[model samples]
Target chain A: SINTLWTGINPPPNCQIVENTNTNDGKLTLVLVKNGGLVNGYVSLVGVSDTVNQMFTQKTANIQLRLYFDSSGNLLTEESDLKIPLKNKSSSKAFMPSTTAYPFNTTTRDSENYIHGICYYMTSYDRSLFPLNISIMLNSRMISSNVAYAIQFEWNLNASESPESNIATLTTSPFFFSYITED
Target chain B: SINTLWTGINPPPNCQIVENTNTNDGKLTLVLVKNGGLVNGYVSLVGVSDTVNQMFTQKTANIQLRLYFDSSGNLLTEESDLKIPLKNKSSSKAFMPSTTAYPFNTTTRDSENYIHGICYYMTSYDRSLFPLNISIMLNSRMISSNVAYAIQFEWNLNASESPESNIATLTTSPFFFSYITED
Candidate 1:
C-alpha cells in the first residue's frame, strides 16, 4: 500500500561522469560529549559515480565503521585525525577535527549540542568496472547513559549505471552504539 | 518533468524506514551470485522503538534500494556490519537456507532457473529496542552467454529519530558484476 507514492522534479541540464584515481584508505571516527543531556546520533555517505564508454557503470565496494567513547559518557573531542579509505587497496585519507565541519553549534548547551555532517571522498579508478569502498566511525560521549542512538548513512548514485535511465537515488544503512566508558 | 510525474504513494512503500542491526562485533557480509542474467536487489531492516507512553512498538526501520545490470563481469559483494558491544551479546536469529520455503528448482533449467530467489536474516537482544539487522540476498544462476549483470544498493533515513515515526531503513552499498564463468 505504501509503494505507489510518487514525486516530481524538472530534468537537470546534462549529466557527466568524472574519473577518480585517488587511492586513499583510512578511518572516520566521531566523538561526542554530553553536558547533563542525552545524546542522539546519525551519519551517512553520498556522491556521484563516474562514467565509461558513453554509458553509465555501477561500482562495487565496502566500508568499515568504528566508535570510541570516554568516561562521564562524553565523547573525547580532542584526539588524532581519522582516516577514510578511498578505493580498494589505496592510501587512506586522514580526517581531522579542524578539517571537518560539525553540524552542531559549539556555543549550544550540552543537551542541545550535537554533531551531524558528511565527509566526501572519491575513488581513484577508471570506468574499467571496480567499486569504491568508504569507511565511517562514531565516538559518542556518554558511555554511562549507555544510550543507543538510531544511526543512518545515505548515498545517492545518480544515473551512474544507465545514461537513459536518468534517475538520482539514495542508499542507506542503520547502526546502534555501545562502548566502554572510563571511570 | 520527473517530479511532476508523481503518483499515489507519498514516501512510497518502495521508500520507507527499515532497520538492520548486527549485535556481533564481527563484520556482516552478503554475497550475490548470478551466472549471466539481470538481477534486481532490495534490502530493509526491522527493530523496536518506544512510543509516547512506556508501551512498546514494533515497526519496519527505514531502508530502500533498486539495482539494474547490462554487462559481463564478476560481481563481488561486501559492506560494514552494524557493530554493537554487549557484555553478554546474543547473536541474532540466523535464517538458514534449509528452513525457509523459498522458490527454486533441482535440475530443471527453466525460466525460474535464472529467476533465482530471495532470502533474509535477523537477530537482536532486547527485541523491543535493539532488533536484528535484516538483509535480502538474491542468487541468480548463469543463463545464456554468461550475459552482463549489474547491482545497486541505496538507503534513506529522513524519518529515523521521530518518536511519531517507527521505521529506519538503510540500503547496502551497491555491488555490480559484469560477467563470471559459471561451473
Candidate 2:
C-alpha cells in the first residue's frame, strides 16, 4: 500500500492533501532527518535578480544543512539529489551528508505553513582553487500532500588562516496532503 | 730621595726607562708611562660589523683587566694612584695608592718599571647617547715602572651584542711599552 500510495520517481501524485507545521519542534525534527547519508544538494549565490544557471561542481568541500516543515507536519523527503559542482564543470558530485542539527520552527500552528528553515553548507575545497564568494542551492521537490522545509549551513576551509564568512540559505515549497494519520 | 722623587705629582724621570726582570725567579716584567691623568686612553667601539651590537651597547660598554706580577714588581709607595676614566666619558678617576705588589709581582724594583694591570670603565652618558662605532686609545705614560704583568679580562658585553662585527683591530701608538722596570 505504501508503494502504491506514492510515486517512486518523478511527477508525484496530485490528489494528496498538503499541511504545514508552524512549531519549532516540528522544524527541528525534520532537519535532523537530513543528517548522515542525506547531504546531497546544490549551492547558489543570493541577491541576484535573474534566474541563475551557473552550477557548482563537486570538489572535496565541507557541507551542512537545516530543514523547515510546513503546516500539518507532514515530513517530505527532499526530491532533488544534493550535488556540489566542480569549478569549470557542468555536472556536480553528490555532497557528503553532515551530522549537525540546525533548529527551525513556526510560532503558531496557522503560521507553520509560512515558516521556512534556511539550509547552509560549506565545502571543504582548497581556498586557492575556490576563492571566497561562492553561491549554493538545494534541489528538492514537494509532494502534493507533503510539507515543505528549508535549512542553512556554512563551510570554512582554512579555519585559522581566514575569518569565517561563508553562509547559505534554504527555502520550502507550499503545503500538500497528509501522508500520515495520528494514532 | 723619596720625597724629592715624589715632589711633582708625576713619577721621576729615571723611573721612565723601560726594563725587564724575572721577580720571584720566573715572573716577567713590563711598564707603561703617561704624563697626565688617564683620560681618552681607553678602548672604544671601533665599528658595528658584528651581530653583538643589537644586544650590547657599544658606547657604554666596559673592559675589566686583572694582572699578575712578580714579587720584584711591587709598588714603591702605598700612596701611588691608579687613574681610570669615568664610565664611557672622557673624564678620569684616581684610585688611592697601596704598598702591595701588583697581583703577581713579588717585590718593588726601584730601577725597573712595570705595568702589571690595566682596565677601562663606561659612563652612563656614553651608554645613553653614543653610537655603536668608537675608537680606543691607551695612555702608556700613566703606568708605573718596575712591575711584572700578565693580563686576563673580559669585555662587558657578549659577542652577539658587542659592536665589533669583524676582527676588532686594537692599534697602539707605541706597539709595545714598559710600565715597570728593575735596577
Candidate 3:
C-alpha cells in the first residue's frame, strides 16, 4: 500500500512549514472577456512538500498516475505552467506531465527504501510539484467577495504490482483555493 | 512515514467517493451565548478513510500524536464529542483520545507489514478516526454569510524510532470547514 502526503523543502535542507496566510488580501480579479468577466489567475506557489510513503514486503512494480483539475473552464494549461525557473531541467521534470507513469523501482532508492526519487531525503523528504505556479479560469459570478471557492484536484494512481494482477488504484481529492475578489 | 489521506469506506467493502456538494447551502448559525453570539456546531462525519503507510526498513517503535483545533474561540469540545455510536467499543477506541499515543508495533500488523490495525483489510484499508463526530465553536462575527471560515486542525506526531535518536516529528495542518449560515 502506498500513502502520499503533501510537503515542501528548501535549500540547506529543512522542511519548512507551508503557509496559508493573506489575512484580508483575499481577492480574485475579474478579467473582462468577450462575453463575460472571468476569474483567471494562479495562486503563487507558496511552498513545496515532498511526497512521502514506503514499500513493505516486496518491491512495488512501476506505479503510474495522472492529475487534472476540475473547474468551470479548462483549468490546467501546460507543463511550462508548472516549471520552477530556479531549479534545473532534471529537477523540474519531477513536476507533473513529465513524471507521468513514473517507474517506481527505477528511481532513486533511499538507504532504507522507505522513499524514492520523487522525495530527496536530506533531513527529510525534499519536494513535490505543489509549489509550481498553476493557472485556473472560471466565471467571475461563481465567486463571492466575502467567500472562498475551491478548484478540485483529482488523482488516479495505479499501484498494481503486475500488469495482469488485480489493479490497485490510489486517489485523493486535493483542492486549490480562491478567496475574496479585489475591489 | 505514516502518510495519512482523508478517505471514507462503506460496508459491503467499497471505498466510496466523498462528495463535496450543496450547490449553495453554505451558512453558519449564530448561537447567542453569554457575552456574544457564537457559531457552535460540528461538520457531519462525512466518511472515513483508513490511514495507509508501510514499514520498509525495520520495525518502528511506539508513536504518539495529539490533535488540536486552532480557531477564534475555544473551538473543540471533549472526547465524548468525537464518539461514533454506530461502531462498537473496540471500534470506537480507534477514534481519538483512546487512540492517543498509539502503540505502533503492538497493534495488528498486515501480512507484509504494509499497514497496521487502524486499517482493517477486508478489501482495502478500512477506516481512520476522521469519520467520528467533532465540534467547533467560534465567534459569530468571525464568520461570513457568503464565505467559508476555517478551524485549523494541527497534528504533532512523534516518529522517533528510538528515544535517544534525533526526534522525527511529523506534522500536518488540517482544517475543518464552517460555511455560510442558514437564514
Top model number, TM-score: 1
Worst 10 residues of 2 chain A by lDDT: A174-183
Residue B119's lDDT in candidate 3: 9
Q: How well is each residue in B80-138 modelled by candidate 3, as lDDT tens digits?
A: 12211122111111122111122122324212211111101111112111111123322
By lDDT, is 1 or 3 better?
1
**Model 2 segments more than 4 A misplaced:** A1-183, B1-42, B45-49, B57-100, B105-148, B152-183
Model 3 chain B weakest 10-residue run by lDDT: B119-128
**CAPRI category for model 1:** incorrect
Output the number of the DockQ-best candidate.
Answer: 1
> B1-183, model 1: which lDDT tens digit per residue?
011001111112221122342222111122222212311111222222322111112233333222222232222121212221111100101111111122223334222222222222111122112222333322232222422322223222222332222322211221212222221
Model 2 lDDT per residue over B1-183, tens place: 000011111112211111121111111111222222220111111112222222233423433333323234333322122111112100011211122222233333421223322212121223111122212212222334543333222233323334332333211111121121121
Docking class of 2: incorrect
Q: Which order, best to worst by TM-score?
A: 1, 3, 2
